[PDB]
Design a binder for this molecule. Structure first.
Ligand code: ADP
Ligand code: ZN
Lengths: 641, 165
């Protein structure tokens, strides 16, 4: 028996126990874990990796918890990760080689002899963020759910130091040991001695990449009393430029502590330690929220290859899923199936839900190879009575969209919608933080009490609503920066309730041009009657029949986890061409409004093409304009007044 | 919230949407408003003047066949009631609906003149449910009766019957 000091770990006993698992696992969690075909569950993923060069082994930690023989290990790597992962680095290499020697094989040997393999363990239990992390939790595996507010520049950090000798033509190198460079005073005596004369040469040395990232942390529960924490965390090589401002994330790593120097003068250290996460894995995506625009992020999809990391950017889907997607797309009522399943707790309002669905698809994005750009979006406003979906819709969008800041009222003004300059107290320098719209370079920016935002603030959106960019000239920065956000707005009329005896253009209390530059405006007036509000009341109270609404599967609707897999396919993979035959029905629909401005026309093409992203059509057909124009007219009840 | 009309006291010649300065969108987020306003009277002011002079003659509260509960024990009782998560019977479910439609039909079709205020809304139906849950929790009861909502609706309506005095 052998054991590490301060530790419960036996190297060889864990080594064989990990191999025993690694050569025998087959989804036993489905059998054992709870009340929930395949084989060799990891061996396929290991013999997958060796031809791709993707040296990373992403590990679902809960494989071990359910499995019969490595409950003895889950509570070790969780509690001793720096050492237990150092074992896995070795065992996996030996467990790759066992798949060599059992194989008649080509020369994989000549590199995997030398190359290095690693593990990223992420699928661990939940925690109350920074707050529950009492000092007993120091140096343990942890995970955090949250988002990024800023990231520092890449920092050079020493890994081999170099020494140049002022005489006698021999240098020296030393590898760093646990944070020190033990510089030899002696001139490597056996050449000759001079007592103290040697140099240290910066540009000969070998460096790691380091990067630091600031995480706004958002627990699944927070105690009454709390407020958001800006954690500071560090990420090493192969994760630098993995994740960046506005991303919504699950990240895992080791919780740490470190001292701080009191001053730049002397080595007195503060005893009240600082704390951070050393990141080991980041889960860039989730099943519940859709996928970041592949056209926008095109610069980084290749950087992941060029940087040699497979930390994933886009949802993987199998043929069994795509086959279902296509078999679903053939049905006649998809146009209403999504518009119901988008909000299974929201009653009727299917004109609203449907145009919102057509916002999420975006439509089409296009450029002229230098001189111009156009993008698929519709910018939306909701108006009419209180006591309606308006505020709840802004949540469901927010909780599906991977990006977006729920701005609100007078609590949101120019310096914090666009970027601002601020003192980073942790280092005391001026640094630039992305504002709300800049963080929202994609997805949706969701705005509420839109008319109670001031006359001064509204003037930023007045550019952004179609030009999708913001341009700056204030001290320290002069740039135009991207603001690809779609915009969605909740508004209420002048006075209160609604008043049909005054024209809507006045009633909204929003200026005629900005109201026009919205692509779709919804009038959501109540107009009360029996045989609607009764059916609504039954629907609502069924949420209190069963104290959690698991029977909401009634009135059949898609699983959200499939709907997001559909949209993040259609969005990613279809570029719907507006056919030259579609013009003839399109222009008359515009001119019929003129008997109002091009924003309607520029909206209809961006809305109708989304109605071709839906149903996955590479080309627009004369029918799909017809539903799009009717939607515009009926969204403002154009027949009535 | 405590608030006062535009002239401190009410004016009976002003409809409440004009007597009250607040906008009805914000007001619709109050699940109950109380028109807790005074009118002089020969009798009722006498018992008040007793209670105030009694409680000013000494700290003690009136000699009713009652005791005013010590607050800390009431806090413990509330903390137990908070643990209760009551469920609505289908019997009351269909009653809440029909009362709501009669309220909403009356509120709209009749009550948009003179003393009439506001409109009935989904939010006021949810108010009645939350109040009906609260009553059942004060019973320490795992279910919500038809006997609860017929009390909850009373508090909703009674808060403005003061206006007719
Ligand atoms: N037609 C409806 N379908 C579902 N829920 C509704 C409906 N009308 C109102 N509600 C409920 O009322 C609340 C909406 O408040 P809301 O009306 O968004 O405030 P605002 O009046 O500022 O829009 C939500 O809890 C929602 O569930
Ligand atoms: Zn020398």
């Amino acid at each position: 028996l052998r054991i590490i000091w301060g530790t419960n770990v036996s190297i060889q006993e864990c080594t064989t126990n990990f191999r025993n698992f690694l050569m025998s696992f087959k989804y036993k969690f489905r059998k054992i874990l709870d009340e929930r075909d395949e084989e060799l569950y990891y061996i396929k993923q290991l013999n997958e990796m060796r031809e791709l060069g993707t040296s990373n082994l992403n590990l679902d930690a809960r494989n071990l918890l359910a499995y019969k023989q490595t409950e003895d290990l889950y509570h070790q790597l969780l509690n001793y990760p720096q050492e237990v992962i150092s074992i896995m680095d070795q065992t996996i290499k030996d467990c790759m080689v066992s798949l060599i020697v059992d194989n008649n094989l080509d020369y994989d040997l000549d590199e995997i002899e030398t190359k290095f393999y690693k593990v990223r363990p992420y699928n661990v239990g939940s925690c109350k963020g920074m707050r529950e992390l009492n000092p007993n939790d120091i140096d343990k595996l942890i995970n955090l759910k949250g988002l990024v507010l800023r990231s520092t520049p890449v920092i050079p950090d020493m890994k081999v130091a170099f020494f140049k000798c002022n005489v006698c033509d021999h240098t020296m190198a030393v590898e760093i040991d646990r944070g020190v460079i033990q510089e030899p005073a002696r001139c490597e005596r056996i050449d000759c001695n001079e007592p103290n004369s040697m140099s240290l040469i910066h540009n000969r040395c070998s460096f790691a990449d380091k990067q630091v990232i600031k995480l706004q942390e958002t627990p699944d529960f927070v105690p009454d009393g709390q407020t958001p924490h800006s954690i500071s965390l560090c990420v090493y090589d192969e994760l630098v430029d993995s994740c960046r401002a506005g991303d919504r994330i699950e990240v895992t790593g080791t919780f740490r502590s470190i001292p701080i120097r009191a001053n730049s003068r002397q080595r007195v250290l503060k005893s009240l330690y600082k704390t951070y996460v050393d990141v080991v894995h980041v889960k860039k995506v989730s099943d519940k929220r859709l996928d970041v625009d592949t056209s926008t992020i095109e610069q980084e999809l290749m950087q992941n290859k060029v940087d040699h990391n497979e930390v994933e950017e886009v949802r993987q889907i199998t043929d069994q899923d795509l086959a279902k997607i296509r078999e679903v797309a053939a049905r006649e009522d998809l146009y209403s199936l999504l518009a119901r399943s988008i909000a299974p707790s929201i009653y009727e309002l299917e004109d609203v839900k449907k145009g919102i669905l057509l916002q999420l698809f975006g439509g089409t994005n296009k450029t002229f190879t230098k001189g111009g750009r156009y993008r698929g979006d519709i910018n939306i406003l909701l108006c009419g009575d209180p006591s309606t979906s308006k505020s709840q819709i802004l949540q469901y969008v927010h909780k599906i969209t991977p990006r977006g800041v729920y701005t609100s009222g007078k609590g949101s003004s120019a310096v914090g919608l666009t970027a601002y300059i601020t003192r980073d107290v942790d280092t005391k320098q001026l640094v630039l933080e992305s504002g709300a719209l800049v963080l929202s370079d994609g997805g949706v920016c969701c705005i509420d009490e839109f008319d109670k935002m001031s006359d001064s603030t509204r003037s930023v959106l007045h550019e952004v609503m179609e030009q999708q960019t913001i341009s700056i000239a204030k001290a320290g920065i002069i740039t135009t920066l991207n603001a690809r956000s779609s915009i969605l707005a909740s508004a209420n009329p002048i006075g209160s309730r609604y008043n049909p005896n005054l024209p809507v253009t006045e009633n909204i209390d929003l200026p005629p041009p900005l109201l026009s530059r919205f692509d779709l405006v919804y009038l959501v007036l109540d107009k009360v009657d029996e045989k609607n509000d009764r059916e609504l009341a039954k629907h609502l109270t069924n949420l209190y029949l069963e104290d959690k609404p698991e029977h909401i599967s009634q009135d059949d609707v898609l699983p959200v986890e499939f709907l997001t897999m559909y949209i993040s396919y259609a969005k990613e993979h279809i570029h719907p061409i507006i056919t030259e035959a579609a013009k003839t029905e399109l222009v008359r629909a515009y001119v019929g409004m003129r008997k109002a401005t091009t924003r309607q026309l520029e909206s209809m093409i961006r809305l109708a093409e989304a109605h071709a992203k839906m149903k996955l059509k590479n080309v627009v057909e004369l029918e799909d304009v017809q539903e799009a124009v009717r939607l515009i007219r009926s969204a403002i009840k154009d027949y009535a007044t | 919230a405590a608030a006062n009309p535009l002239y401190g006291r009410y004016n009976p010649r002003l409809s409440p949407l004009d007597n009250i300065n607040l906008p009805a969108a914000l007001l619709s987020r109050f699940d109950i408003l109380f028109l807790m306003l005074d009118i002089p009277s020969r009798d009722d002011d006498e018992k008040l003047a007793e209670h105030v002079t009694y409680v000013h003659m000494h700290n003690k509260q009136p000699d009713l066949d009652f005791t005013p509960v010590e607050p800390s024990k009431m806090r413990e009782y509330i903390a137990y009631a908070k643990t209760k998560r009551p469920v609505m019977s289908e019997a009351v479910n269909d009653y809440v609906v029909q009362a709501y439609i009669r309220l909403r039909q009356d509120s709209k079709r009749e009550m948009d003149s003179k003393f009439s205020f506001g409109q009935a809304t989904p939010r006021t139906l949810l108010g009645i449910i939350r109040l009906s849950q609260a009553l059942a929790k004060l019973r320490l009861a795992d279910m919500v009766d038809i006997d609860d909502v017929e009390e909850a609706l009373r508090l909703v309506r009674v808060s403005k019957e003061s206006l007719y005095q």
